[PDB]
Ligand binder design. Structure first.
Ligand code: HEM
Length: 153
């Protein structure tokens, strides 16, 4: 459970994300696929984007990153009270896309990397710690939902 002050730090940096959701999403996904190349294989439509410039020019990838960050932002704004928002995401990621928790850890690492890169003055130790706790909670709760659906990834 996060403190109210921790949630405030999470939401303060998230408001900075929201000044450019598309660009943050692009940077996060480019970092994810570069750092952990096994992850790109779950996106059949993005496999032909072989350079960073091609990834940045893809409208499809850019739109997908807005879809991802919008869902995550809406979860974060519930400050842990997120069952209703989390269930559909667990349902598709467990039973359709088959995304292991380890890959959600990789994406979380990429989120934190991009937030520090773009917002160092608003992403010091206490804010990093708060965002880490928020993402850890998201991953803990989605893992429990994965298992409810029969998925042990
Ligand atoms: C912060 C974590 C993530 C969030 C919030 C998120 C959110 C979403 C949302 C909202 C969709 C669209 C609706 C749906 O199918 O559920 C989606 C689709 C998808 N996600 Fe995720 N996602 C996350 C992490 C991942 C990771 C780590 C992978 C795999 C490496 C992944 C692979 C996919 C795939 C393959 C699709 C469907 C894409 C398509 O067919 O167009 N997701 N995700």
């Amino acid at each position: 459970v996060l403190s109210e002050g921790e949630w405030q730090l999470v939401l303060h940096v998230w408001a900075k994300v929201e000044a450019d959701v598309a660009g943050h999403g692009q940077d996060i996904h480019i970092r994810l696929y570069k750092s952990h190349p096994e992850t790109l294989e779950k996106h059949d439509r993005f496999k032909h984007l072989k350079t960073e410039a091609e990834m940045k020019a893809s409208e499809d990838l850019k739109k997908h990153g807005v879809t991802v960050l919008t869902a995550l932002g809406a979860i974060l704004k519930k400050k842990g009270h997120h069952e209703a928002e989390l269930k559909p995401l667990a349902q598709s990621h467990a039973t359709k896309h088959k995304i292991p928790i380890k890959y959600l850890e990789f994406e979380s690492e990429a989120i934190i990397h991009v937030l520090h890169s773009r917002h160092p003055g608003d992403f010091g130790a206490d804010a990093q710690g708060a965002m880490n706790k928020a993402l850890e909670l998201f991953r803990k709760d989605i893992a429990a939902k994965y298992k409810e659906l029969g998925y042990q990834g």
